[PDB]
Amino acid sequence: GSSSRSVIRSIIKSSKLNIDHKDYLLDLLNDVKGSKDLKEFHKMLTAILAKQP
């Protein structure tokens, strides 16, 4: 997968993120606009799991 929305959402829904956090990341991810903006989303996403257990 090369920066696929379907591939990303799958990681969030599967991730152990807060029910409210996931819903937010998935809600915004669906209405994501801009290649550069979409990339930044991943930068923070990984940061979440990076800290997770």
Swiss-Prot record:
Q: What is this protein called?
A: Phosphoprotein
So what does this one do?
Essential cofactor of the RNA polymerase L that plays a central role in the transcription and replication by forming the polymerase complex with RNA polymerase L and recruiting L to the genomic N-RNA template for RNA synthesis. Also plays a central role in the encapsidation of nascent RNA chains by forming the encapsidation complex with the nucleocapsid protein N (N-P complex). Acts as a chaperone for newly synthesized free N protein, so-called N0, allowing encapsidation of nascent RNA chains during replication.
Kindly provide the PTM information from the record: Phosphorylation on serines by host CK2 is necessary for the formation of viral factories.
Comment on protein domains: The N-terminus consists of a long intrinsically disordered tail. The central part contains the coiled-coil multimerization domain (PMD). Forms a four-stranded coiled coil structure. The C-terminus constitutes the alpha-helical domain that binds to the nucleocapsid (N-RNA complex).
* Subunit record text: Homotetramer. Interacts (via multimerization domain) with polymerase L; this interaction forms the polymerase L-P complex. Interacts (via N-terminus) with N0 (via Ncore); this interaction allows P to chaperon N0 to avoid N polymerization before encapsidation. Interacts (via C-terminus) with N-RNA template; this interaction positions the polymerase on the template for both transcription and replication. Interacts with host ISG15; this interaction disrupts the activity of the N0-P complex.
Taxonomy, top ranks, is: Viruses, Riboviria, Orthornavirae, Negarnaviricota, Haploviricotina
**Name of the gene this protein is made from:** P/V
Q: Where is this region: Interaction with the nucleocapsid (N-RNA)?
A: 3-53
The superkingdom listed in its UniProt entry is Viruses
**Which family does the similarity line name?**
Belongs to the morbillivirus P protein family.
